[PDB]
Design a protein around this motif. Structure first.
Motif, PDB file in Angstrom:
ATOM      1  N   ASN A  89     -31.547 -83.672 -43.885  1.00 39.52           N
ATOM      2  CA  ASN A  89     -32.278 -83.699 -45.136  1.00 39.52           C
ATOM      3  C   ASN A  89     -31.354 -83.321 -46.282  1.00 39.52           C
ATOM      4  O   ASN A  89     -30.495 -82.454 -46.131  1.00 39.52           O
ATOM      5  N   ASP A  90     -31.519 -83.999 -47.414  1.00 37.78           N
ATOM      6  CA  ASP A  90     -30.939 -83.572 -48.677  1.00 37.78           C
ATOM      7  C   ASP A  90     -31.999 -82.793 -49.435  1.00 37.78           C
ATOM      8  O   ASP A  90     -33.090 -83.310 -49.701  1.00 37.78           O
ATOM      9  N   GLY A  94     -34.638 -85.365 -51.310  1.00 43.35           N
ATOM     10  CA  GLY A  94     -35.699 -85.482 -50.344  1.00 43.35           C
ATOM     11  C   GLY A  94     -35.451 -86.510 -49.275  1.00 43.35           C
ATOM     12  O   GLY A  94     -36.351 -86.781 -48.477  1.00 43.35           O
ATOM     13  N   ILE A  95     -34.258 -87.095 -49.247  1.00 40.25           N
ATOM     14  CA  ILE A  95     -33.888 -88.060 -48.229  1.00 40.25           C
ATOM     15  C   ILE A  95     -33.911 -87.386 -46.868  1.00 40.25           C
ATOM     16  O   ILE A  95     -33.322 -86.317 -46.679  1.00 40.25           O
ATOM     17  N   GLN A  96     -34.585 -88.016 -45.914  1.00 39.63           N
ATOM     18  CA  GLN A  96     -34.801 -87.450 -44.594  1.00 39.63           C
ATOM     19  C   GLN A  96     -34.445 -88.491 -43.553  1.00 39.63           C
ATOM     20  O   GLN A  96     -34.888 -89.638 -43.642  1.00 39.63           O
ATOM     21  N   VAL A  97     -33.640 -88.095 -42.580  1.00 41.99           N
ATOM     22  CA  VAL A  97     -33.208 -88.976 -41.507  1.00 41.99           C
ATOM     23  C   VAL A  97     -33.549 -88.307 -40.188  1.00 41.99           C
ATOM     24  O   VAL A  97     -33.508 -87.080 -40.062  1.00 41.99           O
ATOM     25  N   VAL A  98     -33.903 -89.124 -39.206  1.00 47.48           N
ATOM     26  CA  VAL A  98     -34.254 -88.660 -37.874  1.00 47.48           C
ATOM     27  C   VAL A  98     -33.516 -89.500 -36.850  1.00 47.48           C
ATOM     28  O   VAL A  98     -33.281 -90.693 -37.062  1.00 47.48           O
ATOM     29  N   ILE A 111     -26.290 -88.656 -43.693  1.00 49.48           N
ATOM     30  CA  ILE A 111     -26.582 -88.948 -45.083  1.00 49.48           C
ATOM     31  C   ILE A 111     -25.264 -89.229 -45.779  1.00 49.48           C
ATOM     32  O   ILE A 111     -24.248 -88.596 -45.488  1.00 49.48           O
TER      33      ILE A 111
END
Ligand SMILES: [Ca+2]
Ligand SMILES: [Ca+2]
Ligand SMILES: [Ca+2]
Ligand SMILES: [Ca+2]
Ligand SMILES: [Ca+2]
Ligand SMILES: [Ca+2]
Ligand SMILES: [Ca+2]
Ligand SMILES: [Ca+2]
Ligand SMILES: [Ca+2]
Ligand SMILES: [Ca+2]
Ligand SMILES: [Ca+2]
Ligand SMILES: [Ca+2]
Lengths: 154, 154, 154, 154, 154, 154, 154, 154
Positions: A89-90, A94-98, A111
């Motif tokens: 997460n940033d 609010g960028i979210q990666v899974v 990211i």
């Protein structure tokens, strides 16, 4: 070969004279280096591993500088190799990666910060930058980050 | 463009996720940098300016490292621009270079150390490396040196 | 056709099995979308229509996000179609554009923000961004803006 | 470069004016996005993990929309990486897929819905869509789904 | 030649009618100009010459604007032509450049700000940007800077 | 890319040093800009709208200069979009242009001044330059002018 | 042939309808004409024939305009055909031309005014422009001048 | 460039001598000009607007000649831009044209006179040439005419 203008170049334990340029070279007093780093991430029982600016800074002091400036171009978080999930997460955007992974291809969430998202962090800067979230009772994840660090002291 | 595997690259203040390699990158804990430096050379009435290892080391601490290791690939000594002579010397071998110059093309004496002459100087190393000799009652010369420095602390 | 690895693809009301990749895809939790929007601009008797961050934000909540982050790549203000003037302005820099138009080609003033002028506006950001100035006793202008919005909540 | 009609484009912190089209752009009020998602799948001792519409919907609310509409183009179920079996199923048709896997290549069962099998699920839709069956006393499987979601509220 | 649509173009003291476009041109109210400037640098006995934002601003008011906005793309500091050293510095990052020069090729130290390092300075902005350091009892250095200035008043 | 002679160019928030030319650039203290402008033309019941030098000057002070010098390369007068006539005139020569227009293609009368007709107007210059004549009880016309303005103060 | 859009063109005493442009043509109210003229030069016993602005103006009123504006592009003075000399002169600059001629090739002295020497003479302008000098007791010379005249009255 | 036979041509405020032809040019005392004109057409409640020879003549006196001769090559009548009809007519032959138009493409009726239909109208000629008929209670139409006028006085 190495700028030998006077005599022929030959690798030997004896130096070689040369004619340097008419003008001394322009010198950069605090140079920059772009390189990947590894961050320790002391175990957390909440399952949430917060990456502050102090974290990257303290890990960048181990590359040589005492009071470093830096930027970040990328952040990859890798979980433990088993059957685990990592959430990167940033904190600002609010960028979210899974990603979920197996024992061979471990979880990998990255990211990427373009030049307009790259932010310059000084020695007075603080705050949370990235946040990693793994399920509680899990091993500590692995964080890799491409930084461009440089000395601040002039 | 910058390793964007998931979404298209676009410079903006918003980062870009990506898939990093299957394996974390191999990290170099104490990296190296090859760069020219400038040495102060406090005035000497003898006309002889001795370049010790402490000199290069203290001038390399100003590039960021506290306890640096280094090697030398080149040394150029430039006199004052007037009608002056500079004599550069390698203290161990005995290589001696001379140049006389005018106001436009100032004196320039360079020594070049091939990979077999390059010597690794640690934090315990000392001794005289290069010696510059100008006529007494002359301005201080200008020294440029290409070094490959790196942190020692592991 | 759509990644059918097991059986042939055929559009029908019956699904098609397939072999997905060895590794789950990297997931972006809060995706981004670049799209034009339209802003209401309640009538003002001063003739001056101020575009705040709250304006763009409230108009971007109608695209789906509740607490959005956004940037702006362009702003075009169009006046009423008659014989009218519109003045668009960036409040910070001071860039000012004017256009007068007829009934066919209505007035059109645009400002374009390059990646170094693009600014990231969060949910705590406020302030005036753009200002539109039409003669008093005139219809309300038409504002189009290319934004890159994304969810903030992680 | 970005539609700069008036002045030359140059990335800088200062915007660029431009002439937008004669007509405002056609705006899509509730846009669509096709993207993979990950579903939690709370542990079940029966060994059977039912994917309802509420499941996909609640997991799609975390991408930003509050009351989303969606369709499904694919569903891949991945078991734990060990020596396990996963059985994926479409509840309506009866399509059943099986895979057994090892620690490297974990079990992977996918169903693919062609445009005639794609079904539109609203906020009032419910029912079971997909069903995953793993042996009891097994880890929770991993579900990936390609959805096309969009806001419902007009 | 110059947009003469009605009659032939001929340079003469008599104007030429023409048909202008169907639509008035889009007007930029506060235009920008990229141009080098020269900064006075009143003598300092410390040998240290600080470049504030007020400095560039006051030197940019002499190009016409009263309350200017500006950015900086480059800064070159040139010492006196003799045997002198100039040290240029960015106060925020810590980038430091050195050059020594002769009577022909005077000392020249330049810093270059890429679009991500370019910072927009308004009329309320202040602080130190660049710092020049010459040996005490030396002539005043010469500073050249490429700025992109524009009017702020709308 | 931008004159980077020392290190590679890369857009980032960190500047780039460079070697500027041997000689400082030649500086233009009062630069020039060729750009279209718009003139207000307060309503007149006579139907005759006189363009003096004070008019262009006061409209050019809004582009930044306080005491500007200027020349004129073109003048286009556009009437209201309806069924109206505009008559443009050069007061000195006597060149007269007429156009009648409809609601789509509004009336457009332009005069074009070749380099021998271009006249330099200082801050002490006055007099009438152009004259626009519309039927009484008509809307105010639209005037566009291509000027080359520059600061006078040295 | 002549813009016949409706029916075929055929020269006959019967007109031809056509579709004119969508927009009326831009009209020039006081057009210009470049043409040679002849000046009377009443006999003078001094042998000196002065060409004032009134001269050209009165000779240009015979081409149709009542209050004309004009410029001059050329002036050729031809003497009588015999054995005579003519001296042409520009009164302001001082350019002086001489020619002697025979009965076949009569004397011919010309001055040519480039666009930067072309001067606009209004109805209030006066003064001497050109001066012709022939030996006393000689026939009157012949003056040809290429002028660009136009109406002044708007 | 402009007939410079003696010295090189260069645009400057200083004239250029030249050798004119052996023979003075043949001079046309009353030259001709082909140009479009606009006719006032004072409002008429009958809806019928008669174009006499006096009309064209009085409108051609405003182009400079006092007692002009002319011919007509074309006549276009344009109605008001709204929903109106214009009927153009040649009074002698009987050629009648009609057009109805909308707000964009206003009504346009043109008659075209070939060289055998072109008639020379002197200062003693009178009579009706063209007749325009619009519905009563309508705006005044717009008349454009291509004439070849010339001075009559010898
Ligand atoms: Ca440093
Ligand atoms: Ca070797
Ligand atoms: Ca180290
Ligand atoms: Ca950028
Ligand atoms: Ca979210
Ligand atoms: Ca919606
Ligand atoms: Ca302004
Ligand atoms: Ca000229
Ligand atoms: Ca000035
Ligand atoms: Ca006239
Ligand atoms: Ca004929
Ligand atoms: Ca005549």
């Amino acid at each position: 070969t190495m700028g030998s203008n006077l005599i022929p170049y030959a690798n030997s334990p004896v130096p070689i004279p040369y004619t340097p340029p008419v003008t001394p070279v322009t010198v950069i007093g605090n140079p920059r280096k772009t390189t990947w780093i590894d961050i320790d991430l002391s175990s957390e029982e909440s399952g949430i591993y917060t990456l502050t600016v102090g974290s990257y800074r303290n890990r960048i002091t181990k590359l040589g500088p005492s009071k470093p400036n830096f930027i970040i171009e990328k952040v990859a978080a890798y979980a433990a190799p088993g059957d685990y999930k990592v959430v990167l997460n940033d904190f600002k955007t609010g960028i979210q990666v899974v990603d979920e992974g197996s024992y061979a291809h471990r979880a990998a969430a990255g990211i990427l910060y373009p030049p307009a998202a790259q932010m310059f962090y000084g020695i007075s800067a603080t705050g949370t930058l990235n946040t990693i979230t793994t399920t509680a009772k899990d091993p500590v994840p692995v964080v890799r980050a491409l930084v461009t660090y440089w000395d601040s002291e002039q």
